[PDB]
Write a protein that binds this ligand. Sequence first.
Ligand code: CHL
Ligand code: CLA
Ligand code: CLA
Ligand code: CLA
Ligand SMILES: CC1=C(/C=C/C(C)=C\C=C\C(C)=C/C=C/C=C(C)\C=C\C=C(C)\C=C\C2=C(C)C[C@@H](O)CC2(C)C)C(C)(C)CCC1
Ligand SMILES: CC1=C(/C=C/C(C)=C/C=C/C(C)=C/C=C/C=C(C)/C=C/C=C(C)/C=C/C2=C(C)CCCC2(C)C)C(C)(C)CCC1
Ligand SMILES: CC1=C(/C=C/C(C)=C\C=C\C(C)=C\C=C\C=C(C)\C=C\C=C(C)/C=C/C2=C(C)CCCC2(C)C)C(C)(C)CCC1
Ligand SMILES: CC1=C(C/C=C(\C)CCC[C@H](C)CCC[C@H](C)CCCC(C)C)C(=O)c2ccccc2C1=O
Ligand code: SF4
Ligand code: SF4
Ligand code: SF4
Ligand SMILES: [Ca+2]
Lengths: 732, 80, 74, 184, 82, 93, 70, 41
Amino acid sequence: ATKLFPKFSQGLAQDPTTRRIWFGLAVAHDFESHDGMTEENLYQKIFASHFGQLAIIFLWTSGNLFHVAWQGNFEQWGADPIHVRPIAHAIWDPHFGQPAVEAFTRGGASGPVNISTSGVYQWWYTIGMRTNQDLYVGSVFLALVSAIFLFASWLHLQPSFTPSLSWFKDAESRLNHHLSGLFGVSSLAWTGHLVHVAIPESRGKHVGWDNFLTQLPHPQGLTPFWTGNWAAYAQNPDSASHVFGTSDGAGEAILTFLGGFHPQTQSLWLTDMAHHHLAIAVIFIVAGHMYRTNFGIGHRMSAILDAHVAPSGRLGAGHKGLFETVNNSLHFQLGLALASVGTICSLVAQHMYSLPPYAFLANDFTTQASLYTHHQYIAGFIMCGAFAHGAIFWIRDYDPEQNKGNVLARMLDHKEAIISHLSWVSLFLGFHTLGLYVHNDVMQAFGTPEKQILIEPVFAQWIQAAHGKAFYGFDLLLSSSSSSAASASQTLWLPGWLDAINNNQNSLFLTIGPGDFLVHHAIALGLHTTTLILVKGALDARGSKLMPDKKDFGYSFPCDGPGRGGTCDISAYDAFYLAVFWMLNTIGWVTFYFHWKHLTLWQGNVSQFDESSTYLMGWLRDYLWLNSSQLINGYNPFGMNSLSVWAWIFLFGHLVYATGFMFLISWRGYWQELIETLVWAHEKTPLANLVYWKDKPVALSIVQARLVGLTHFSVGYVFTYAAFLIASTSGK
Amino acid sequence: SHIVKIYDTCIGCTQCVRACPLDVLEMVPWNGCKANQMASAPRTEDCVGCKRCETACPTDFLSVRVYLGSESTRSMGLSY
Amino acid sequence: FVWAFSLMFLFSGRGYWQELIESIIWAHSKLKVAPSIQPRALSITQGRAVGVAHYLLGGIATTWSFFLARIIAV
Amino acid sequence: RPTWLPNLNPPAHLKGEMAGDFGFDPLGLGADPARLKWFAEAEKTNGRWAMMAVVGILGQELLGVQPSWWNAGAKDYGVAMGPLTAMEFLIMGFLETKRYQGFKETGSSGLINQFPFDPAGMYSKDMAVKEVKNGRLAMVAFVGFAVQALASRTGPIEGLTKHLSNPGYNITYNLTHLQDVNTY
Amino acid sequence: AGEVFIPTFGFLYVAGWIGYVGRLYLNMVKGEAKPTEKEIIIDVPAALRLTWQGATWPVQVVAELRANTLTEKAENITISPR
Amino acid sequence: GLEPYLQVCAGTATMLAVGRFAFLPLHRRDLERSAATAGPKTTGSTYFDSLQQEASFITSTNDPAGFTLIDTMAWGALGHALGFAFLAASSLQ
Amino acid sequence: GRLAMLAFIGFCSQAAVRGKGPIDCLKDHIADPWNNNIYTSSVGKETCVTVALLCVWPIIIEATKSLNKG
Amino acid sequence: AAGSYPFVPPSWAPSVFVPLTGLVLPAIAMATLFVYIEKDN
Ligand code: CHL
Ligand code: CLA
Ligand code: CLA
Ligand code: CLA
Ligand SMILES: CC1=C(/C=C/C(C)=C\C=C\C(C)=C/C=C/C=C(C)\C=C\C=C(C)\C=C\C2=C(C)C[C@@H](O)CC2(C)C)C(C)(C)CCC1
Ligand SMILES: CC1=C(/C=C/C(C)=C/C=C/C(C)=C/C=C/C=C(C)/C=C/C=C(C)/C=C/C2=C(C)CCCC2(C)C)C(C)(C)CCC1
Ligand SMILES: CC1=C(/C=C/C(C)=C\C=C\C(C)=C\C=C\C=C(C)\C=C\C=C(C)/C=C/C2=C(C)CCCC2(C)C)C(C)(C)CCC1
Ligand SMILES: CC1=C(C/C=C(\C)CCC[C@H](C)CCC[C@H](C)CCCC(C)C)C(=O)c2ccccc2C1=O
Ligand code: SF4
Ligand code: SF4
Ligand code: SF4
Ligand SMILES: [Ca+2]
């Protein structure tokens, strides 16, 4: 009879098959579809759900601090961060054999433990933490914060504390508060930590909760700030002879603009990081005082959007009629948020390898590699969600009559132009980028390396020379001291930026060769193609010659039948499903280029990359095959070492990846009929016929199997690489 | 159960009816076509969502539309 | 390459390619270079055949190169 | 009716009925009545605790208790802080649960069981306007007593008996001459 | 200049030559009886009379831009429902 | 003299004066068209969302030309960031 | 049915736990109560935390009908 | 309840938490959910 599992979906609740259990977990956080859903209730539910996610994040962080403190080597690693290996947690495996118990005792422990690649150690050291107590206190604090958010999820869901839809649609104020309070007052507050705790701790001086109200951050005090002589805070910077966590070479500056990196830590200076947060905090607070609130002075967002219509009428009604579109659509906003967060997630990876922001971060190669790959992959999934929710906006929440002539409606007008032009660029990048790899491979095979085509990335080399790179010899801007920009900065960060950029032992603007030219264009191909797939699905989300009523069929529908030749994978969910593969392929190439460019940098054999990368055969034998030699030997017929888990995961990843294929290659039908035979056998089998199924066994849904196979496929690509990226970098 | 709807763009060809595998469609009399017939969907409780009728609709786009929705033993065609 | 290329027909669907072709045809019809014969995406059964064909061709070719170069060299 | 802002427009929710209503709600935090009702008991009780506290910080110092009011907490009192604070939780916990219970019922204050706590009466409009206004002055004072301890490290009375002595020694001297008070 | 630069135009000239000759043939078979049966069984004679016509393709292509005949009117190209 | 007072005072004064007689009318005109015409009225009604609803103390200034407290704290705020950007710039840079 | 069998609950040491015997702990407390209490014992820190938490549970439960289940 | 931090877990905590979380705890969750999932309406 009817079940209760799918409370939100009565159809699933009445479903006699097992699909009700599977879909009940999927259609669970799609409230917009829940039976009896009001816009205000939807916002209130989402608002509370946000608190829940914030409780998990803080609880997750507290756990890391707790395990690092209870089962870690922080104090030992802090004493010698270039020899001690940060310990993440202990391995209590009731299955471990004695050799496993021995081999996994590393980083200075009395039992099997796991070295950490998250880089929390380097970060917590740089910010002021020095003992295990600092970690315990922080974990308790964050745990309390998690408890508070959890109560708030309850409080904001109980009548009288449930915000009205109007409050949820109060944009002008929300943006003002978030920009000034959430972004600004949280950056100045951070400068307050740095100036008061981090900088003193780096100069060897405990300024904790016991003596912070009595310890002057600057010798002069707030006097220079009040007198306006702000410069006093930028005098006596820490000398190059300074040692992090020691008064050796320690200076007195609190806010400066030295640039480059501390000599010993090889990471951005703290003072330069203090002044950064102070400067950005000021901008955020002032920017917060822009939109109108309940006082008067201010800007109404609607007016700005409507007042921006090109007089030539090239953009039609311009942004007029767009404020309601964004304010009344929670998919449009989510798409913009995912796009913004995704892009910034990549900036963190591209700016944290070049400029290590934490002490002794560069030294830890395995951490650096596993942190770049983490963010670059997370960023890619976020970007797929951006376009995904954008397509949902086109169908679930787009009013074609209100948006009439607006920049958003004149996009579908030239939808073919946008889609077709993205096709030409993808083909051009594909036909050529690959052709100049096969051409080089042929020359390598025929022993004619000189004949291989090696185009020079001159355009990038000039942007490098502009920043001050001299190797190329172009004498442009910063490269030329007699310049205006070079002379202007000569008294600020310039003296340092050059010293650091013109040092080949780090990753600030690394020398690029013709090998980088090909891979960079290959990355572009992935960016354009993945984009084309998502863009095509978004534009054709509610329209198409094959399926002109796609909006009536919703977002996630298997197909429109075998009619009109084939409607297989015609839903805008299947532009996402397919784009995911290209996203993984694109990120795969970028995280493989990072790893090789850097493994060759760290091993000292830069010529290895500068030559093998030119042809694809080098990428496989010199990179994947050569580095995999150790990982695969984690456990052999002669014994096992500490890399056994990674070898096991490496194979485990392949298994999950291959399993994903069956759900994608095979389709619903052979399995369904097979399940029918299984149902017959059980009903006929004696002693087993007694036990029976409450839900009728049915094969996975057409769309369901698409996501199940894709999850297996993705999980594999992640575990298989995470294993390589960590066991090949650590093994050396 | 799947939702089957017959739009005014029907020519009363009866092809969709002679195509339904579970007797879900029938031909009722109408006046907007020269064949004085318009397919109706009396028993959409037996619709499996095969969409065979659509593959048999000759009118521009589709006069008959099957919107796959809730799934039951009949809708899933389960003999279990 | 051939083995991997086969996973675009074994994991995808005509629906996506048919519409994609529609946009390409538009570009062709704008410059008045549209082909007289209507370009249509591969049938559901055809895509299944193309993928399996390339999938088998690629894998067997990989082993053929592996085995032959291994055993001829050693 | 008196207004904090000259020529003010008392918000709709702020009616003359309430104790020291001077129409002060730049943000209208108590626009909702239930919240405003609680806020008013939470205004009175924050003030009750601040009046008591300010009296201590002055009194303790005037008699001459040894540690400065701020350092008073760190002392060799004859009791381990652990059990001490543990009892603090038990006594105040009850003393507070009883109060909340009564406030949940009689929308006034009180002690334990004697709500409309008066043992003298004196619950007139005048005395309750005095309470809200003496409380507000005390709440502002305690925030002073705290920042004059940070920037100048001088007890309340000692601070008055240094600005009266030298008409300078002001916020324009303390903040600038912090180096002397604090340590590097 | 001999590397990439000069080679660039060389490909562009032949590329446009191939494309222009193709469109010349397509637009000739359009109209002619059954245009679909002259794409499978190519008319090698007329296909051989149009190959050299693409030698001066740049001159002819521009003359078509400056005459509005290279492209089609936007109200004569079928578009997918928005 | 040339102490912080000279820089801070001048900045505050100039901005307030320029915003009390020069841009004040433009400021008012821009506020109107923006909030009344293209932008409509917010806080329709219902809920304790009166927080988003305009206050009143701001709309209570005898000052001619209606220089509200928010305007004084607006132009003055702009002025206190010029006094401290001019002094600070001379400090180093 | 709640009973004063709590003495025999922490019967590890009867009234006290992992601290001397039974009626001896009473005599000890009378002597020096502040320095002879569970809070001033190995389990003192946890006991103080739990005692404090318990003295808030009432208010937490007795809030705006702050209760739930599903 | 020793040294400095008075909440440092005992050495036997792993020999209890790991077994409970992964064998006992999951069984309760799976069984409890199983009943709810199959709960009739
Ligand atoms: C009931 C027992 C009790 C005991 C044993 C103490 C003991 C202490 N108090 Mg405390 N307090 C107590 C209750 C309370 N105090 C305060 C409010 C204050 C203030 C305003 C100050 C102290 C301070 C201090 C410490 C002075 C030494 C020092 O530099 O700080 C070492 C000790 C600490 C830092 C502990 C204080 C932690 C934190 C600031 C608490 C913040 C919330 C509340 C103020 C109260 C928290 C709960 C109470 C029970 C501690 C000291 C050890 C002084 C201090 O320096 O503390 C900042 C001080 O200025 N107390 C409240 C108000 C709710 C209490 C309520 O029960
Ligand atoms: C000063 C006032 C203020 C402040 C501080 C906030 C703050 C917040 N609001 Mg909010 N809001 C306000 C006023 C305010 N609001 C008003 C007046 C309204 C009425 C319109 C709303 C309505 C509102 C709604 C409807 C929602 C929020 C939400 C949120 C939260 C966003 C989630 C998050 O984690 O962001 C955090 C982001 C930052 C702290 C800064 C971003 C910096 C980027 C992302 C990265 C920086 C990393 C840095 C460079 C390096 C880090 C290194 C290391 C630390 C890891 C956030 C904590 C959401 C929520 O509830 O979530 C729970 C939400 O649903 N607000
Ligand atoms: C190794 C596997 C593989 C390869 C090589 C490709 C390659 C490509 N995919 Mg793809 N894809 C794959 C797997 C793969 N995919 C998988 C597993 C999925 C998930 C199902 C997808 C899903 C997907 C989608 C959704 C899309 C693509 C698209 C594309 C094209 C992007 C445009 C381009 O770069 O043009 C460059 C052209 C080439 C690189 C071809 C090289 C030239 C040929 C090989 C030479 C000519 C033939 C030669 C002379 C001899 C061979 C034939 C002879 C025997 C007769 C591209 C050719 C996009 C697209 O279709 O473009 C519009 C797109 O929409 N893919
Ligand atoms: C007259 C033949 C002809 C012409 C003029 C064009 C022209 C064009 N094509 Mg196209 N194409 C053709 C044939 C042709 N194509 C054929 C036969 C196919 C099937 C393989 C395709 C498949 C194709 C795709 C998938 C795409 C284009 C695209 C494009 C545009 C991008 C420009 C470009 O780089 O070319 C691109 C050309 C190709 C990628 C492959 C065609 C190359 C062949 C070898 C040229 C045709 C020669 C022809 C047989 C000669 C006939 C002579 C006659 C006497 C028999 C462009 C206007 C892109 C686009 O739409 O831009 C928005 C794009 O996405 N074409
Ligand atoms: C100098 C040069 C290069 C410089 C490139 C730079 C800076 C900008 C390039 C812009 C480019 C390459 C193209 C812009 C094209 C835009 C439009 C609207 C042109 C479309 C062309 C059309 C429609 C013609 C199609 C043709 C017709 C109609 C008939 C036949 O001609 C065939 C065909 C299909 C070509 C670099 C990359 C350095 C490299 C070195 C050569
Ligand atoms: C009554 C009247 C008048 C007038 C007077 C006056 C005197 C006015 C002014 C007023 C004012 C006086 C205004 C101002 C305002 C301002 C504000 C309210 C703010 C300030 C500050 C700031 C804005 C700052 C900020 C910051 C910081 C905090 C730190 C560093 C950085 C910065 C600087 C950025 C006259 C006589 C003509 C006549 C008639 C009557
Ligand atoms: C724990 C931990 C963490 C987290 C963090 C977060 C997320 C948050 C926090 C937060 C916090 C923990 C903060 C602090 C605070 C404090 C304060 C804030 C105090 C101050 C004091 C004073 C005395 C001052 C005052 C004032 C102001 C405020 C304004 C102006 C004026 C004045 C200066 C007077 C991490 C993960 C990183 C790691 C490690 C651990
Ligand atoms: C890529 C792909 C396509 C597109 C495949 C196409 C368009 C086949 C490509 C064949 C050629 C490239 C097109 C034209 C063929 C001509 C005979 C070539 C003449 C060109 C001259 C150079 C001779 C599908 O149609 C499809 C359908 C169902 C499931 C998956 C897929 C799928 O993955
Ligand atoms: S094969 Fe499957 S996905 Fe394709 S049309 Fe048929 S039912 Fe739909
Ligand atoms: S989907 Fe199949 S069973 Fe249902 S009406 Fe159409 S033809 Fe009949
Ligand atoms: S196939 Fe279409 S036109 Fe023919 S009877 Fe059915 S609905 Fe009418
Ligand atoms: Ca410290």
